[model samples]
Structures are given as structure tokens and as C-alpha cells.
Target: VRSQATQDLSEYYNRPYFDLRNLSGYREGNTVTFINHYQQTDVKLEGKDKDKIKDGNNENLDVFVVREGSGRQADNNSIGGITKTNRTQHIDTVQNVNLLVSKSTGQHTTSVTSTNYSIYKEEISLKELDFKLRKHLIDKHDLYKTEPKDSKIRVTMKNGDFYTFELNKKLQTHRMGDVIDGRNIEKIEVNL
Candidate 1:
């Protein structure tokens, strides 16, 4: 009787095992339930997709899937994305201030110049530098006097980079209220 029982157990252990490649799964609540032809497995994912895969909390079950490639072919020679441009950290806004005295005082002069040091570079976002530009004007007392056409901001970026907005254009089109606008004020104009 003992020998017969041993033989039956060995036969069951040596039986062939098969797995179906065409399995399907979906997320229901916190668990990802998978169903193949013969069996079903549940994987628990608490928060997000990538985190669960990285943690590897469950063993003994392996699941892998690849997304279908889009129809369009990608260019291998592309250095960066299409929006890339060569740029430097020299981001600035220009404002000019003029003080007028009555003829009795005999003073009529115009002073136009770029603001102080460069505040931003190629990596800084326009959103981040907008307020800084405004503050620069306020510091130099040129915020009110600065106009669209008279002043412009210029950046000499490398091959692919350029300013998003044109600082030399009319104020009405771009709106003087916008802070992303720049001026072409040159290096020599940088007087306090």
C-alpha cells in the first residue's frame, strides 16, 4: 500500500504544466484580476501602475505586456524634441525711465538702459521669470515708463532656442500687461 501511494504522488508531480499566453486583465477596485483559459490571478495595486511593478510585492506570478507601436515612424537623428532651441541663461526685461523738470529748472533728459544682471537662463521657464522681470523694472523705477515699441528684450540662444514672444513688436498685440515679453536693450544700456 505504501509503494502504490508513492507511485501515484510521483505521477501527479511529474505531469506537464501549460500556461496560456493570451491572458486578459482589468482593474476592479484595488486589485487587477487576470483570466486565462484555465485559471485566474489577482494582483493588488494600491495607488498607481508603475509603483506596483517596481515594488514586486507578489511572486510566483509573472505578467508582461507591451503597448502596440503607433503607425508613424520616429526619426532616429532627432537631437531633441521639435520644440527644443539653443538658449542661454541671459533672460532679462528692459525698461527706461525719464525725469522731466519744468523749463524753470531747465532739465529735460531721457535715460534708456537695460536692467541690472541677467536673472534667468535657458533652463528657466517663462512663467518662473515673469515676476522677476516685473520686479526688476520696479527696482529701477522704469516699470511705468517702459513701452512696447521703444524697448525690446533680446536673447541669443543656440541653434534651436529663441524667445517665445517678440519683445520688439507693438504692445497692443502682445499686451504690455504680459510679463513674458522681453526687450532688445543692449549690454551697454545696463546702468542702475
Candidate 2:
């Protein structure tokens, strides 16, 4: 993952400090390559700014462009911890869900994918409840064993077209789960 980067918003005769030095320039196509070492990471915006940039908890995020040879460009991949694979994040346009059942037990996992599978949500389904004992069986894997319950159901939502949910019932009660949040979701992504 990249630690930091910078861009010179300069243009015409004005210096970057004046109008970020970007007054006399016209927009052009740009691009950049980024990398993250972890499976999930949060990206943040950092760099020189002006009133238009709106400095605060939110300055900028995962935005990049590839210019031919426009001098030095601003850094976008400063922070690292981003996931570029089956990661999923919810959008206002989400639509479908898929159920995956274990080959051995009747327990099942639920997956919610975006229209294009670019983002997804996952969770455990009610089918896993043990109707006979009137409680969760706490058993997983390829077979079911009768014993004291302590298993847990783990949900993983990859921000893509599909989601993967699994059962890990044995971690005790399902309290204190987890979630990912941000002020501007459109510019952010979450993964597991």
C-alpha cells in the first residue's frame, strides 16, 4: 500500500497556492495505480487544499485519474488497507439475495448482491435453528454432531457481485457483531 502522494493543481500563470495553480488549465483524462496489503482497509483524502476542497473529516477519498504527462500529480493512494477483490458495499440500487446451504447439514447462509454483483451483503439464515432442541445446534462443517452448543454464524459481504456467508457457531452468543460505516459511502468501500 502507498503511504502518501501529492498533486500540483497549477495552471496558466497563476501559482498553485493562488487558485491551487489550476485556473488556466483544462480537464484531461488521468489515471493511477493503487495497492493495499490487507483484506480490508479504509481510505482517506490528504493534500494541499483550498475553500473548494472543503477541509474536514472529509477532504477527498479513493479518487484518481491518469494524465499523459501533466507534471507531478496529486497523491490519492496515501493510506493503505483497501481490498480490491470480492469486497461489497451497499448502494441505494441493491436488489437480489442468494442462499447457500451446507452439503452436510441443513444450515444455510444468505447472500445479498448488487444488480451487477459489485457489492453484496451476507448473513446466516433461520434454517440453521435446531427445531428439535429448540436452539441453535452450534454444529457446522460437513456433518452435525449432538453436543453442547457453542458455534457461531459468520457473515462476509464482499463489495462486488456476490457475497459469502459461513457458520462459525461456537463463539458463544451472537451479540457484539460488527459493521462498517462512513459519512460518504459512495466514495468508500468495505471488505472481509
Candidate 3:
């Protein structure tokens, strides 16, 4: 029972940030690459007259491109990056997750490529909570031994503040758990 409960809770709190299926990309040669596309924008108003505004772009451009080759298997491996093989030249785009293969001429050459729609995990922290409240809720829910089917949470802070938000179904609970665990919230009430 303990192991099962631990496993369930572990799985729930260790989910991926995004559904791997939602990502799109292709692998070339000896490389397998994937991307979780996303972006964000922020604007601020600043000036002597308060008429001008400053803008900022907060984007997640972390792409994954990988390749591996050596010995006899080192022949013709390629991905998203620069590659040079047998005096032949290849180039990649502005950004890429590249995996280069060992060229047929016993050399290596590589190249790369992008996307728009993106999902970002924003984390925010809460104030501390009360020990009694924490124990009360934990005993009430059996959090460690049971996994909730749904991804949602309700928090009651020591400062008399209440917060509730249901996460996107597509999101992994582990990621959501990370967001909550990182915070300093007082009491946590999970609606599984």
C-alpha cells in the first residue's frame, strides 16, 4: 500500500511540462530532435511624460537536436547544425537542435531549423503556512498515499488569502506540483 501510494504520488508530481504529442519536429540522418514551441511578450510604460512604453519579449527558444556516430556506424550522421564532409559544405538556420553524423568520407557535416505557438510554465511563490493547517489537510486528504485524478489545487495562506486554479488537462501534474511545492503557501487543499 505504501509503495503503491508513493508511486502514484510520484507519478502525479513528476509529469512532463507539456504533452510530448503536442510537440512537432522531425529527425534527420542519425539525429532525433523535438521542440516545445512557445513565446511571451511584456510591455511597460516609462518616460518623462509617461507617454512612451518599453516592450520586452520573453520567449523559450530551448530546442533539442541530437546525433551520435562512431567507427563503422559513424557514417553519414546529420542533424541541425554545421557539417563538413568530404570537402562538401552544409549550414543550419538561426537556431537548431542538431545531431551530426560521421560523414561517409570518415568526416562529419550537420545543419538545423523552428515554430510559433508555445506553452510556458510560469512559477510564483506564496507566503508560509501554518503547521496545524498543513497537518489537518494532509491527514484529511491522505496526500502521500493517494493520487488525485484531476489536476487542480486550492491554497489557504496564513495571511488569510485563498487561491484556486484548475490546471489545463493537457499539463502534467508533476509540473503543476513543482509550481506549488516551490511556493511558500500555508495550507494546501487538493481537489483530486
Local distance difference test, per candidate?
Answer: 0.30, 0.22, 0.28
Better of 1 and 3 by TM-score: 1
Model 1, 1-192: lDDT tens digits are 234443442332233322223234454544444566655544434222323323323222323211112222322111100011124323252332222211111155545443345432222223223233433444444432333233333332324343333223211311211222223322212122
Q: Against the hidden reference, what TM-scores do the models get?
A: 0.25, 0.19, 0.21
Please report how far candidate 1 places residue 128 from its true position, in Å: 2.0
Root-mean-square deviation of every model:
28.8, 20.6, 23.3
Model 1 TM: 0.25
Q: List, residue by residue over 64-145, the lDDT tens digit for candidate 2.
A: 1112233443442111111111124433433232223222233564332222112222221111111111221222221232
The lDDT of model 1 is 0.30
Clash count, candidate 2? 30
Residue 29 of model 2 has an lDDT of 24
TM-score of 2: 0.19
Could you tell me the C-alpha RMSD of candidate 2 in Å?
A: 20.6
Q: Candidate 3: misplaced stretches above 4 Å? A: 1-54, 57-152, 167-184
Across 71-177, the per-residue lDDT of candidate 3 in tens digits comes to 12433222221111111112222222111111121136322111121112112221111122223334544444443334345555446676554322222212211
User: lDDT: which candidate is best?
Assistant: 1
lDDT of model number 2: 0.22
